[PDB]
Chain A
Amino acid sequence: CRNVLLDPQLVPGGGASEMAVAHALTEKSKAMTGVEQWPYRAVAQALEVIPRTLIQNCGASTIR
């Protein structure tokens, strides 16, 4: 409730935010093309947790 009070913007769960930011980070890697592009591709890699977590918790194949 306070979170809805704090920001009342409901967000799609699951990997919806994960793979989104990942691209946008790697797109930011493509854009910025600096050194921190690699940290992005390192950080954007962190987003996939929820898919992996959920693919674990469902017991499916993640790589597909």
Chain B
Amino acid sequence: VKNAIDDGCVVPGAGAVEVAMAEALIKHKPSVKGRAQLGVQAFADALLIIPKVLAQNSGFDLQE
């Protein structure tokens, strides 16, 4: 919370910003070998662990 009052910038939690990445990472932007297109895809898929682990821990599905 000291990182709250030191920061005039604040990032909204509960997976608000990650879907703003994984989707807005929409591919062929790293089209070259697709390895980045896969690597960004790989990276895109680790973004949602907070939306995952919770719907995991909490009700329903980390996926559904």
Q: Which residues of A contact B (CB under 8 A)?
A: 61, 64
Chain B residues with CB under 8 A of A64: 59-60
**Main secondary structure on B side of the interface with A:** loop
Q: How many A-B residue pairs have CB under 8 A?
A: 5
Kindly state the separation between the CA atoms of A60 and B31 in the bound complex, as whole angstroms.
Answer: 38
Number of interface residues of B (CB under 8 A): 3
B60 nearest CB across to chain A (Å): 6
Interface residues of B in 11-51 (CB under 8 A from A): none
Kindly state the separation between the CA atoms of A64 and B60 in the bound complex, as whole angstroms.
Answer: 9
Q: When A and B form their complex, which 5 residue pairs have the shortest distance between CB atoms, in order from nearest?
A: A61-B60, A64-B59, A61-B59, A61-B61, A64-B60
B55 nearest CB across to chain A (Å): 11
A52 nearest CB across to chain B (Å): 17
Kindly state the separation between the CA atoms of A63 and B55 in the bound complex, as whole angstroms.
Answer: 14
Chain A residues with CB under 8 A of B60: 61, 64
Q: List 5 A-B contacts (CB under 8 A).
A: A61-B59, A61-B60, A61-B61, A64-B59, A64-B60
